[PDB]
């Protein structure tokens, strides 16, 4: 996989290689333009002009000293608190776009919801925009109609600016995917006071490496149509040994660093890249935060989603108070789509790996998804035994649905993969394995004298059994399902009972005058004159049998055929008696 990548890009193979991080072509919105002045900039260095698309989302245009052509505009996404408290300075976190970043706006704010995610933050979000294929660096010489000093523009030009005009302490983390992940890295090794914290989501934090080079080229041919050797030079230059992340990793040692991939081709390269990075680290004894998890969301949702799982880790590295972070967590995708009714409260926590796929706590329980089942958020007394369970673990597997309501009005129920939970005030939450739950559906579930579940299947003479309200319901020893209900309940659960009879063969059956259950060694009748009583398959039975069992001349039992002397066994009906002592069958009435 990994080889198969380089091989193509060998074979000549780039068409198409960076169409994956393409943005769409948006227009920032017009607003408001001002003029700050900044005292103590560097010469040639000045901002033009700064356009407010909202009150927190400024757009500069800057007159660049390293990059004097054309001007470099630059998005701020400003702190929450940034009217509210205009005395207090805030710390930087950089995101830098992609290879194929676009002069139009900055990808992140194109394809991502970042302006509200921060919205709610003390930090101000710097966003550079364009430089297709940059890699945010200062290029050996000029290419392809560009002149690129990027990582002068950054660090000795657009940092002043934010110190002096912009209300910036001087805490940064810088961050970024694609090319601005690589850069994020090389240029902390480059500058290693200017940062407190560097993150890389999807970038190649590999250079030099035998191959990595051919790759690099690939991509600055196919983003626009670049020439790596007019960046760092010579295939095994200074350049490249200075912007090679893996080699530098030593020079980050007490930052906070934060690196993740996996969400086809440049994306396995930065899986590699990534993977030898962390190695290296661990080696250095640098420690870093790693993210190969796999997820439902792939490209730009996904890269935000990194965000969030970065920034707690941010605020840590710059100092951040609680009162600051606002709301850390945010929900993605499916369980995104599936909490949209705001049901489920603000999110504890963001989508995290259980066993068959994602869930996500939140105020009022939690959510569950997999690529089969979908998205559920489950509440209250279910969810709660749900978790007690195991969630997905437990052999329930995944909701496949939200909590429902009983026509009755009194129950609410949940649906799983391999079963059901049902709950009442009264009953409680118990889950019904999926065969029981068919059996039980055969009388009518909760709408038939059974009701609900009062309790767990649990081992019964290697079987299982359930109690519910009006019974219970079995797992035979053969794994088949019949339930138990009433008067026969009442009997077939007595000391000793189950001895006689062993396991149901079928469900209580409704005849003339009352009713009766077949079991492996026998029956249980019943009416309301006998009462339930247990006969045995045999001589006794078969004799009955004859004259019409129950419908006939003896009619319903009206004790338990029991035992006598050597083989001696009676049962006692409403209109005589059947006995078979010493081998014989006596039909005295």
């Known amino acids: 996989s990994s080889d198969a990548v380089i091989g193509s890009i060998a074979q000549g193979v780039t068409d198409g290689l960076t169409d994956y991080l393409k943005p769409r072509v948006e227009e920032l919105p017009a607003g408001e333009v001002t003029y700050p002045e900044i005292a103590g900039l ?5 901002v033009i002009s700064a356009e407010w698309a909202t009150s927190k989302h400024v757009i500069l245009t800057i007159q660049s000293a390293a990059m004097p052509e054309r001007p470099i505009k630059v998005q701020l996404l400003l702190p929450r608190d940034w009217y509210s408290s205009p005395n207090r300075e805030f710390p930087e976190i950089w995101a830098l776009d992609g290879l194929r970043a676009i002069e139009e706006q900055s990808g992140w704010t194109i394809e991502t919801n970042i302006e509200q995610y921060y919205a709610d933050k003390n930090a101000i979000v710097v966003l550079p925009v364009g430089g297709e294929s940059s890699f945010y660096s200062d290029w050996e010489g000029p290419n392809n109609g560009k002149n690129y000093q990027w990582e002068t523009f950054l660090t000795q030009e657009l940092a002043p600016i934010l110190d002096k005009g912009f209300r910036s302490n001087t805490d940064r983390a810088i961050t970024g995917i694609s090319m601005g992940g690589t850069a994020a890295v090389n240029i902390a090794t480059h500058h290693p006071d200017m940062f407190k914290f560097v993150g890389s989501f999807s970038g190649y934090l590999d250079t030099t490496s035998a191959g990595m080079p051919i790759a690099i080229s690939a991509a600055l041919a196919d983003a626009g149509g670049y020439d790596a050797n007019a960046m760092w030079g010579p295939v095994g230059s200074e350049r490249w040994q200075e912007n090679d992340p893996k080699s530098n990793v030593d020079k980050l040692k007490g930052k906070t660093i934060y690196v993740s991939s996996g969400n086809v ?23 870093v935060v790693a993210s190969f998890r796999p997820s439902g969301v792939h490209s730009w949702e996904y890269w935000q989603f990194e965000m969030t799982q970065a920034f707690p880790h941010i605020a840590n590295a710059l100092g951040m108070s609680t009162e600051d972070r606002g709301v850390e967590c945010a929900p ?15 999110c504890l926590t963001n989508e995290y790996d259980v066993t068959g796929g994602k869930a996500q706590d939140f105020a009022n329980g939690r959510a569950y998804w997999s690529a089969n ?3 559920f958020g489950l509440v209250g007394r279910i969810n709660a035994r749900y978790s007690e369970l195991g969630g997905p673990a437990s052999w329930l597997g995944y909701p496949t649905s939200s909590e429902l ?18 709950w009442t005030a009264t009953t409680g939450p118990w889950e019904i394995p999926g065969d029981m739950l068919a059996a039980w559906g055969t009388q009518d579930y909760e709408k038939g004298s059974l009701g609900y579940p009062t309790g767990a299947a649990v081992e019964y003479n290697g079987g299982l059994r359930q109690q519910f309200e009006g ?9 088949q399902s019949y339930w138990v209900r009433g008067e026969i309940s009442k009997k077939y659960a007595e000391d000793g009972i189950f001895a006689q009879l062993g396991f149901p063969t079928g469900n209580e059956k409704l005849i003339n005058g ?6 492996e060694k026998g029956n249980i009748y019943w009416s309301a004159s006998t ?26 039992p009206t004790s338990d055929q029991t035992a006598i002397t050597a083989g001696g066994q009676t049962i006692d009906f409403q209109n005589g008696t059947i006995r078979q002592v010493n081998g014989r069958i006596e039909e005295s009435r």
Not at 42 to 46: E, Q
Not at 266 to 286: K, Y
Not at 471 to 479: A, K, L, M, P, Q
């Open 332 to 346: 993605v995708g499916a369980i995104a789509d599936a909490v949209a009714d705001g049901a489920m409260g603000t």
């Open 514 to 519: 009352g009713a009766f259950q077949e079991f």
């Open 42 to 46: 560097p010469d040639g260095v000045r």
């Open 471 to 479: 019974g219970y319901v079995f797992r035979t020893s053969n794994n």
């Open 405 to 422: 309501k009983t026509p009755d009005g009194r129950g609410r129920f949940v649906t799983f993969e391999h079963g059901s939970i049902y």
């Open 373 to 375: 089942t979908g998205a």
């Open 531 to 556: 009462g339930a009583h247990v006969i045995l398959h045999g001589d006794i039975f078969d004799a009955w049998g004859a004259k019409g069992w129950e419908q006939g001349e003896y009619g319903f």
């Open 265 to 287: 081709g440049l994306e396995v390269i930065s899986r590699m890249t990534s993977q030898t990075f962390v190695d290296r680290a661990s080696q250095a004894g640098v420690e």
